[PDB]
Amino acid sequence: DAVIKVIGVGGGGGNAVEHMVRERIEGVEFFAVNTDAQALRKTAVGQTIQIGSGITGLGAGANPEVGRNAADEDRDALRAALEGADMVFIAAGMGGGTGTGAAPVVAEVAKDLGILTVAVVTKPFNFEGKKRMAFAEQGITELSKHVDSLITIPNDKLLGRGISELDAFGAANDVLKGAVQGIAELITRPGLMNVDFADVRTVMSEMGYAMMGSGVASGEDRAEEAAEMAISSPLLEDIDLSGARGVLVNITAGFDLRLDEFETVGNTIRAFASDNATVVIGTSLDPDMNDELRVTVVATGIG
Ligand SMILES: Nc1nc2c(ncn2[C@@H]2O[C@H](COP(=O)(O)OP(=O)(O)O)[C@@H](O)[C@H]2O)c(=O)[nH]1
Numbered sequence: 001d002a003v004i005k006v007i008g009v010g011g012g013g014g015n016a017v018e019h020m021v022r023e024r025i026e027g028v029e030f031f032a033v034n035t036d037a038q039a040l041r042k043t044a045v046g047q048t049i050q051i052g053s054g055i056t057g058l059g060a061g062a063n064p065e066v067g068r069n070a071a072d073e074d075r076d077a078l079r080a081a082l083e084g085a086d087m088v089f090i091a092a093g094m095g096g097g098t099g100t101g102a103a104p105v106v107a108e109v110a111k112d113l114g115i116l117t118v119a120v121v122t123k124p125f126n127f128e129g130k131k132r133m134a135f136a137e138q139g140i141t142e143l144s145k146h147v148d149s150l151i152t153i154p155n156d157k158l159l160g161r162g163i164s165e166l167d168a169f170g171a172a173n174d175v176l177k178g179a180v181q182g183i184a185e186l187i188t189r190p191g192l193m194n195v196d197f198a199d200v201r202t203v204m205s206e207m208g209y210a211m212m213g214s215g216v217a218s219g220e221d222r223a224e225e226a227a228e229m230a231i232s233s234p235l236l237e238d239i240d241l242s243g244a245r246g247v248l249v250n251i252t253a254g255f256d257l258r259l260d261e262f263e264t265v266g267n268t269i270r271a272f273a274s275d276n277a278t279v280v281i282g283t284s285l286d287p288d289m290n291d292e293l294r295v296t297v298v299a300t301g302i303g
Contacts, residue, residue: 002187002197004028005085006180008045009103010067011036012093012122012169017045019173020091025181026284027188028089031081033106035061035070035098049077051102060097064135067101078109086197087116087187089180090147093172095124095132100139107146116201118210119147120179122172123154149210149300151179157235175235179212182250182296186282191253193262195282203246203280207301211239218291223251223261226295227268236299242274245301252284253293265295277301 006028008017014032021030021044032045037054052070060066071078082088088110092099103119110117121143124132144150158171183204186195204210213236215229227249231241241247251257251265266281273279 002027002087003085004087004089004184004188005031005082006089006091006184007031007033007106009033009090009092009106010096010099011039012096013091013099013103014039014043014045015169016091016093016173016176018043019170020177020180021045023177025177026185028180028184033071033078033102035067035102047081049074049081051077062097064097064101064139067098068105069101070098071102071105075105075109078106079113082110082113082115085110085115087118087184089184090117090119090121091176091180092119092121093124094121094136094139095128096135100135104139104142104146107143111146116205117147118149118151118183118204119143120151120176121153122176123152123156125155125159144208149204149207151210151212153235175212178214178296179298182212182214183248183298185252185284186250189284189286191251191257191283191285192259193281193283195280199280199282200248202278203248203300207246209302210298210300211235211302212296212298214294214296216292216294218293222293223264224268226293227265230295230297231268231272236297239299239302241269241272241297241299243302244273244299245277246299247273247277247279248298248300249279249281250284250296251281251293252286252289252296254287254289255285257283257285257293261293269297
């Protein structure tokens, strides 16, 4: 079976991976990497990796340098946790000290082991201030040198009263989960048209920027409607699919998913994509879905 590891780095990334643990992603192994020993005690994520001593200067933990130095000190533990994976996902909320600085170290450890590495990260809300935004962008520059594909979700693009801080980050958590689940479950729980992992590697390895959209529909034309909804999703509104060197598509549904629906989704995606590129369409089986069919589209090698 495939070995797929999902690593939440820092507080924001740990929170996103905790959401993935609660909502489930089939067949993946979850890890939390953090300088914050208290966060590692509290997390429901089953495997934790302490980086650095866990002993803090006041406000020192906000510098990405602290997260970078901590991860570098514990590169042996990172390597030992990642060794043997077929794919690694790195989730982080960029802008703090630990995610921003440690996530590129985790990514490079995986890259140097030869593991297909995909990062799905957020940028801070503008209200968090320019300093955090500058830290985040510098961290994304560094992360981009060490990953195969990078999906960057600006919190400002996703999102009132009754909206708590917990609720505000829940929106990001759902998108990060959708990207990880959409890619991984093609491998860990295939449906009638099983994707070949070499096709996943083809569209994700050393590709650069990527972006995800998703849609879901029920009824007679569910396949068309879900695919069209994914292409028209707010995250892909600015990305022409025919500018993507790769396109990965996950159709998720129950036992009733039909070959004609696979063909229809493929026709729709190929209508919008280019043909000087590589397209990969796979399926996942979710036995608890009745009526509904979800389409997740990951455009890779955009720029
Ligand atoms: N998804 C998510 N993002 C968060 C959360 N808390 C903060 N963030 C975002 O992630 C960034 C860094 O988070 P923080 O906990 O301060 O530092 P970290 O330990 O390096 O992750 C922040 O600037 C926020 O944009 C959270 O609970 N969930």
